[PDB]
Design a protein around this nucleic acid. Structure first.
Ligand SMILES: Nc1nc2c(ncn2[C@H]2C[C@H](O)[C@@H](COP(=O)(O)OP(=O)(O)OP(=O)(O)O)O2)c(=O)[nH]1
Ligand SMILES: [Mg+2]
Lengths: 406, 553
DNA sequence: TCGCCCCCCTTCGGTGCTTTGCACCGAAGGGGGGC
């Protein structure tokens, strides 16, 4: 079979990202994986006259204790031509978020049966590091559609359709969505029944070459106001600053007749009784937060953005928007492993879960605004990553003024 | 001998052509040193004569070697390098002796003139044109081009390292029981074979290198400890750095001090407790490398302390993979940290220091977190794993930090160690307002055109204050308003501001700052007993904030 | 009168914020060391 001509976007050059340090066990796995991939002709050894580079590392899920090579092609993907522009993108189905169980399959190995444009291969180079820099790095480049390159699902699009046709034929109410190297497969069958047809899809796929999600439990968490029977000056100042912030999100919310319950230079702990005209304003404002916002619709031509705040005791709130204060979704992510000690593990898992929800709901991952120092994140995050994709992110230091989402 | 290895194709950057730079004058002794090398380079096939068809040129010179009697040839390829393609460099880092394991048999070999044994892409050679002068007018220069990797060309190190990796790879695969540290042309070869078999494997390696044209002269063939390697001395049981001679001066220039600080950083990899903060402060605000800078008293003390440390003999030990790595950190003051990495007590593998100021405002807990991160990354590079930590911070202190700080933070498995001074939070803001304590409503405003501002407050006890401010900013006036509330309140106070900025800084509990105003606020916070700090939106008519915002007008 | 690599300390300039300075960050200057 012949290659599809691929180009970068005009005026852009290939990626030039340095390899970061890797533990002994990750270096050994990459050496084993790449040595076999080189034997099978999927990759070729290259030298330093190829000026491009992309970081490589490895992940190991614990319900499949084999290492998985992960190349961080985020930079290369940003510079690669769009395939929506040249008639090759994968349409997202609105029915997947309706299914009660969704299983994720790693189908990245199917790409290795299609060759890559000879003139594009140089942009895929990566470098295996060496413990205590005993040797120079060892470099490879792909000869086939790489795992994690956004052009691989697009070029393989024609083929995966033909491979899947009989399964979707025989199961018209199971919905399958391809995102990168992943198939998201959802249905409404009982928990062990659904798992069985997953194993049937797996065997049909083998004919040629994670854990159950539950979207009907992705509860949205709205802005709530506290309920007490006695209210301090500080309580009502906390209440007013929160509503003033929410007046950029919701419509017709006032603080005029809570603001001057606080008339005068008052002590922060003096209890102020609520006027009937204040309880009128508050129970009103709580019902606006009860049911959400009118005029907020997804736009596929714009990027998704996610903000996360640490709340404590294992809780993490998050919002997904495209335009400021027009949240498509607000939520709260909860603890898992039970020690609840490791903030970086919790944030890394929160990012995978939030990004997974975006894939199922809208078909792509958001750019994350992460409440963590860049160097703290980079010291530890790969130790907890379990997805074959990696979202875009940036690092912010925003102190809380209100705790709007708690 | 030139390697029969295949040339690596190399190109100029798109649109560019070759360099054209006239040659300059050199001494009589350097021209005959080069002519000896050059006519010998021509007879060994390393260079070839060219003439006027090739229009490119590049100047040449020579420097002498640590080997006192040999000369090193260099061509000033600064212009050709600019027009040469980029490379992805394969040297990712520098091997460290603390990453070595104990070996029964050890050898250090060096390949001679390794660059000149690696052929250069034939289509590229014409861009390496140069000219050898021979005094001034006695002749015009003879013209050559390189057939091999030139010293001074941007791509020569990468193409030597890559070629060396290819040549060695057969022998590494055949002898996995033999560790070969490969740095440029320097080969450390360790094994657990008895000296007899080991020397068989060395001659076998040497013969394999020579078939590919890499000579290994016995002059650079070490077979007995102590081995000289990467600036260290390798003994069977331990390693030392080669001697570090510090400059000693009556008068110090900026450039002298820069040299001194560099020597001390290098020493800090094995000499515990080195400090460079006061010496480095002398470089701040200077404007010439030859400007004389008098040492402050603090820098003299620091220098003397370092000098005491460096006359004590030290050594590192080698890595035992069957034992844990342990990393212990001490606080030295003024944002300075020192650490040791060991496996058995009082036998350091190496040491180090962390002294970077990250951010305008920070505290000891953050900086300790940063030291831990620097150490974790260094341990991954050298040993492929992170160490267990021993830290002078109590579990209560850390738990108080990661529950009241809004950013995700973490430290891996660690054990408290009581080595004062301990790392501690210097104050904590109350989560709830304080009963019976005064309540200050603070505010400050400045005018952008003016340099002019006011800071002041009002109080639930009837107190008020306003002070004029000159050459200030909007953010400064807000910090000033908080400064006065802390100044005029008792040991317990409640404060309300409308500065997200100020609340942002102070809520992160900083204990140090590059700003003297923020430093003053930190001093006042440490002296207090309880402080609750609250925010309200500005210009919304809120009682307290209202009256003070009126007042600051 | 040269090349490539890692490290540290200082300085500078680009970016984004519901900003008007400020805080962050990468690159470049200096130094150490390696070949
Ligand atoms: N461009 C350049 N390369 C150097 C320099 N110092 C060392 N090297 C490079 C070139 C050398 O081929 C290589 C190793 O140098 P060595 O000092 O170990 O030996 P060299 O090849 O110079 O001659 P020799 O092995 O003693 O016969 O690394 C330098 O100052 N400038
Ligand atoms: Mg040599």
């Amino acid at each position: 079979i012949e290659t599809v001509p691929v180009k970068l976007k005009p005026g852009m050059d290939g990626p030039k990202v340095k390899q970061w340090p890797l533990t002994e066990e990750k270096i050994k796995a990459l050496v084993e994986i790449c040595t076999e991939m080189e034997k099978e002709g999927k990759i070729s050894k290259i030298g330093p006259e190829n000026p491009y580079n992309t970081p490589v590392f490895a992940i190991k899920k614990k319900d499949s204790t084999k290492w998985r090579k992960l190349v961080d092609f985020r930079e290369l993907n940003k510079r690669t031509q769009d395939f929506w522009e040249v008639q090759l993108g994968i349409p997202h189905p609105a029915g997947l978020k309706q299914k009660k169980s969704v299983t994720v399959l790693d189908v990245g190995d199917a790409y290795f049966s299609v060759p890559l444009d000879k003139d594009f291969r140089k942009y895929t180079a990566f470098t295996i590091p060496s413990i205590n820099n005993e040797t120079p790095g060892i470099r490879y480049q792909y000869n086939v559609l790489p795992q994690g390159w956004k052009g691989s699902p697009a070029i393989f699009q024609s083929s995966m359709t033909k491979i899947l046709e009989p399964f979707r034929k025989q199961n018209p109410d199971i919905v399958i969505y391809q995102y990168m190297d992943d198939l998201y497969v959802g249905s409404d069958l009982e928990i062990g029944q659904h798992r069985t047809k997953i194993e049937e899809l797996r065997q049909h796929l083998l004919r040629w070459g994670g854990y159950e999600l539950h979207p009907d439990k992705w509860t949205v968490q709205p802005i709530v106001l506290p309920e007490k029977d006695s209210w301090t000056v500080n309580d009502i100042q906390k209440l007013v600053g929160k509503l003033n912030w929410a007046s950029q999100i919701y419509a017709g919310i006032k603080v005029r007749q809570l603001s001057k319950l606080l008339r005068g230079t008052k002590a922060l702990t003096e209890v102020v009784p609520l006027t009937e005209e204040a309880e009128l304003e508050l129970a009103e404002n709580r019902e606006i937060l009860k049911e959400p916002v009118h005029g907020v619709y997804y736009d596929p031509s714009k990027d998704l953005i996610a903000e996360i705040q640490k709340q404590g005791q294992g809780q993490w709130t998050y919002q997904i928007y495209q335009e400021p204060f027009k949240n498509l979704k607000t939520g709260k992510y909860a603890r898992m492993k039970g020690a609840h000690t490791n903030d970086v593990k919790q944030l890394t898992e929160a990012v995978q879960k939030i990004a997974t929800e975006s894939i199922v709901i809208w078909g792509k991952t958001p750019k994350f605004k992460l409440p963590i120092q860049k160097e703290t994140w980079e010291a530890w995050w790969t130790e907890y990553w379990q997805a074959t994709w990696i979202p875009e992110w940036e690092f912010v230091n925003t102190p809380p003024l209100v705790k709007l989402w708690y | 001998p030139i390697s029969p290895i295949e040339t690596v194709p190399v190109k100029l950057k798109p649109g560019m052509d070759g360099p054209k730079v006239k040659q300059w004058p050199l001494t009589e002794e350097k021209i005959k040193a080069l002519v000896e090398i050059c006519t010998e380079m021509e007879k060994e096939g390393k260079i070839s004569k060219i003439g006027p068809e090739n229009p490119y040129n590049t100047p040449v010179f020579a420097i002498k070697k640590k080997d006192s009697t040999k000369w090193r040839k260099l061509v000033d390829f600064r212009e050709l390098n600019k027009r040469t393609q980029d490379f992805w460099e394969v040297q990712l880092g520098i091997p460290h002796p603390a990453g070595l394991k104990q070996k029964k048999s050890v050898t250090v070999l060096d390949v001679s003139a390794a660059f000149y044994s690696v052929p250069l892409d034939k289509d590229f050679r014409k861009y390496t044109a140069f000219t050898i002068p021979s005094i001034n007018n006695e002749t015009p220069g003879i013209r050559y081009q390189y057939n091999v990797l030139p010293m001074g060309w941007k791509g020569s190190p990468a193409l030597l390292q890559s070629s060396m990796t290819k040549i060695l790879e057969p022998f590494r695969k055949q002898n996995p029981d033999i560790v070969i540290y490969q740095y440029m042309d320097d080969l450390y070869v360790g094994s657990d074979l008895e000296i007899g078999q080991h020397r068989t494997k060395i001659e076998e390696l040497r013969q394999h290198l020579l078939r590919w044209g890499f000579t290994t002269p016995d002059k650079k063939h070490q077979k007995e400890p102590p081995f000289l390697w990467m600036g260290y001395e390798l003994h069977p049981d331990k390693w030392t750095v080669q001697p570090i001679v510090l400059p000693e001066k009556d008068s110090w220039t900026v450039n002298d001090i820069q040299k001194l600080v560099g020597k001390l950083n290098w020493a800090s990899q094995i000499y515990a407790g080195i400090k460079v903060r006061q010496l480095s402060k002398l470089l701040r605000g200077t404007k010439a490398l030859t400007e004389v800078v008098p040492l402050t008293e603090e820098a003299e003390l620091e220098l003397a302390e370092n000098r005491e440390i460096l006359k004590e003999p030290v050594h590192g030990v080698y890595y035992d993979p069957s034992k844990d790595l342990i990393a212990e950190i001490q606080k030295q003051g003024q944002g300075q940290w020192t650490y040791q990495i060991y496996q058995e007590p009082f036998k350091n593998l190496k040491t180090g220091k962390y002294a970077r100021m990250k951010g305008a405002h920070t505290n000891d807990v953050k900086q300790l977190t940063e030291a831990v991160q620097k150490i974790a990354t260094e341990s991954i590079v050298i040993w492929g794993k992170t160490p267990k930590f021993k830290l002078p911070i109590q579990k209560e202190t850390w738990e108080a930090w990661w529950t009241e700080y809004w950013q995700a933070t973490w430290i891996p498995e660690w054990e408290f160690v009581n080595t004062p001074p301990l790392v501690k939070l210097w104050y904590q803001l109350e989560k709830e307002p304080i009963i019976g304590a005064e309540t200050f409503y603070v505010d400050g405003a400045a005018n952008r055109e003016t340099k002019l501002g006011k800071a002041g407050y009002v109080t639930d006890r009837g107190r008020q204050k306003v002070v004029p401010l000159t050459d200030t900013t909007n953010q400064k006036t807000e910090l000033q308003a908080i400064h006065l509330a802390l100044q005029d309140s008792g040991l317990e106070v409640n404060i309300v501001t409308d500065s997200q900025y100020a609340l942002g800084i102070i809520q992160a509990q900083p204990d140090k700052s590059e700003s003297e105003l923020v430093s003053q606020i930190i001093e006042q916070l440490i002296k207090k007993e309880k402080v609750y700090l609250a925010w309200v939106p500005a210009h919304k008519g809120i009682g307290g904030n209202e009256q003070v915002d009126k007042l600051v007008s």
